[PDB]
Write a protein that binds this DNA or RNA. Sequence first.
RNA 1: GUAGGAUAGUGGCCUACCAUGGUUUCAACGGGUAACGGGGAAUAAGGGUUCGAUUCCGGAGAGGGAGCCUGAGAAACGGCUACCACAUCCAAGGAAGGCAGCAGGCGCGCAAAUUACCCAAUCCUAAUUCAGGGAGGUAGUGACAAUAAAUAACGAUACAGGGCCCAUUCGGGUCUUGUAAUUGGAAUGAGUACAAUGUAAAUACCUUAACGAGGAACAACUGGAGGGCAAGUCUGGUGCCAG
Lengths: 134, 182, 145, 55
Amino acid sequence: SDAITIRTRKVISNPLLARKQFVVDVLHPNRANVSKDELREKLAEAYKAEKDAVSVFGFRTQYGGGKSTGFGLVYNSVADAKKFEPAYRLVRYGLAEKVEKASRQQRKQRKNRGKKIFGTGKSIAKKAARRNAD
Amino acid sequence: PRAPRTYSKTYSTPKRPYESARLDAELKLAGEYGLKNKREIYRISFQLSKIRRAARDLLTRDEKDPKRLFEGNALIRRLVRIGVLSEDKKKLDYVLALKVEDFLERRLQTQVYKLGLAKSVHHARVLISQRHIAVGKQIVNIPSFMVRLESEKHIDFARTSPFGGARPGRVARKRAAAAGGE
Amino acid sequence: MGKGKPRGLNSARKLRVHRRNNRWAETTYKKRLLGTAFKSSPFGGSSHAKGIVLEKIGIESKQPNSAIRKCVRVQLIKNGKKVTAFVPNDGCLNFVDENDEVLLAGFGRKGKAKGDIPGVRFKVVKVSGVSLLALWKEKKEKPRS
Amino acid sequence: ARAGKVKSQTPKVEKQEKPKQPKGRAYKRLLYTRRFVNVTLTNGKRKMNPSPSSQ
RNA sequence: GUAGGAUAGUGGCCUACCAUGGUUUCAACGGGUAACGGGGAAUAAGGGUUCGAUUCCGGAGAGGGAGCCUGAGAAACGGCUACCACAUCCAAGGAAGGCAGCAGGCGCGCAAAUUACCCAAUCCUAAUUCAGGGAGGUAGUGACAAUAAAUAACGAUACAGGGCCCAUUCGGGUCUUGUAAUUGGAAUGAGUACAAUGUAAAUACCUUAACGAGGAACAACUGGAGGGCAAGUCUGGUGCCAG
Ligand SMILES: [Mg+2]
Ligand SMILES: [Mg+2]
Ligand SMILES: [Mg+2]
Ligand SMILES: [Mg+2]
Ligand SMILES: [Mg+2]
Ligand SMILES: [Mg+2]
Ligand SMILES: [Mg+2]
Ligand SMILES: [Mg+2]
Ligand SMILES: [Mg+2]
Ligand SMILES: [Mg+2]
Ligand SMILES: [Mg+2]
Ligand SMILES: [Mg+2]
Ligand SMILES: [Mg+2]
Ligand SMILES: [Mg+2]
Ligand SMILES: [Mg+2]
Ligand SMILES: [Mg+2]
Ligand SMILES: [Mg+2]
Ligand SMILES: [Mg+2]
Ligand SMILES: [Mg+2]
Ligand SMILES: [Mg+2]
Ligand SMILES: [Mg+2]
């Protein structure tokens, strides 16, 4: 029917980053869209890499289904992948977890507040408490 | 602050509006090669105009001497590739008079109709618009594509969609459903 | 005849000077230079100006065609000067009313009169934030009073 | 009146429910047909928008 | 000019003493600029003319003018000290200020956007792989400007134009074109929408399933219709009026 014809164009082996980085080229004949997980699986099957250390991004399919042309790396290990790849990518993959944090504006406000106070806040709190009577 | 993305108000209006004969000619041209507007014609003229200007410039220097020889030659080659220039004519002074009609004739507009496929210019255009026709195996839906001559034999109906014959296509499906129901 | 201007190979400065001198006979150039638009010309050398409708005034037309041309005495907001703006199409003056804000435009002639309406230099365009043509059409409606 | 008398005086005739003259390229095609393909009749001279033949 | 003073240093930069020079119709000096300079922009035969606040390079300025600390580097203004002009907070004794950063408001005006999301990129700073960054990007608004182009297409039957086997009158119409609220099959993406793509996260794009076109819509406006100048000696309403 289709068979998800995957290729790996422009393979640069990277001893510095500890990976094989490349352009993922992939075909759909009559299927439409490849899916990322599937692509990863395919890569693993090809390269003996395992999804854990495969890492893909970019793409945008050509026009009129058919083809898709993304960017894929295959690290020398899982650990290596973890300690080099940006966090967003990891999150996308499922490997890492989403970093739960406050809003940027909120953070900024907090920082400002901190700047405004001096020393330890405990003292300030104590002072406030004391005032409470007044 | 990145850099100004450049553009050209490429495709330029004529200096008088209502030169009646000219208008008529334009209309005729449109009829011949099924255009939505005079705009397209104007664009074509501009394209050709530029080429003409270039040719003139080249002439204004000595053929034998370098820039003229090389740049001009390159231009000629490009023209040939496009398929507006003939193979008999590759002498620069032939480019000088190319004409807009020729340019129009090289479009994926007409290179559908010229190769059969459609039946009646407008129809071809419509087909092109509606996600049929793949010059390679990549679906062109610009009428004013300009076919490469080297890839004119390769103009087919689309791999996907009907006419090429992958899927029948929507109305047909509906009809089938109706039949089934019956 | 050598024909006036010096044709010497080193007579360039003189020529330039002459040209400059001549430039002050050309009217547009002069205007550009002296800032007649910036110093006079009710508007501030601008395309448009908002102005207050002081009163509706019918002005009697020039000659040949004889009629009353339903103009408005407008006071420009930014400068404070007082001008007379013709009001286009049928009626229109009613729509404009009295004491309304009114966005003026030039009539066409880079200043000057416009055909038959004597001592009149401006089209009313918008009345209190709409557009006169639109109102006339009734494609758009007025925002009440 | 003495302030847009003529606009108020006229009878409002209504837009007749006619079929759309098609947009974009269709119109152009139609124009072409009118012009060079069909060829209008001429006693001696061409005319784009003729009259009903009368004084 | 001589000498000193100062300066990181040259130097009337400043001081002392002396000389009388210095510039100028090859426009000095003064006045104006709705003048920041240049790269460049618009126009575009050749020569030109106008514009250049504004993505790059320089220069200035941080309400005005002044003065200075620290520092390699500031005469810094998201440093200080003063005065003017403006203004806040007050228990009246006193305090704090400076959006020509970003966002936003008033104000002015013909005239210009969100008090959004983030450091993933781009680069930058430090004690510095690690933090920060309204620099920067990301969307939002956005008909500034620019590019690409949907707004039916193919049928059949039904009424007319064109080729004509032959034109004793016809006519079949064997062949090709245009018109009908006929009708019929074949797509379509503009819309929507699982998904997957994107992405810092999102949107949107590209990719798709599913629904979604038949004049009632899944509807093109603007201007014009005597000339200049493309196109109405059409019909009524008007009757120097209103335009
Ligand atoms: Mg499709
Ligand atoms: Mg008269
Ligand atoms: Mg000295
Ligand atoms: Mg300037
Ligand atoms: Mg200035
Ligand atoms: Mg500048
Ligand atoms: Mg200014
Ligand atoms: Mg600058
Ligand atoms: Mg200010
Ligand atoms: Mg300062
Ligand atoms: Mg500030
Ligand atoms: Mg600063
Ligand atoms: Mg601001
Ligand atoms: Mg604007
Ligand atoms: Mg910014
Ligand atoms: Mg919008
Ligand atoms: Mg489209
Ligand atoms: Mg109209
Ligand atoms: Mg009219
Ligand atoms: Mg009319
Ligand atoms: Mg005419």
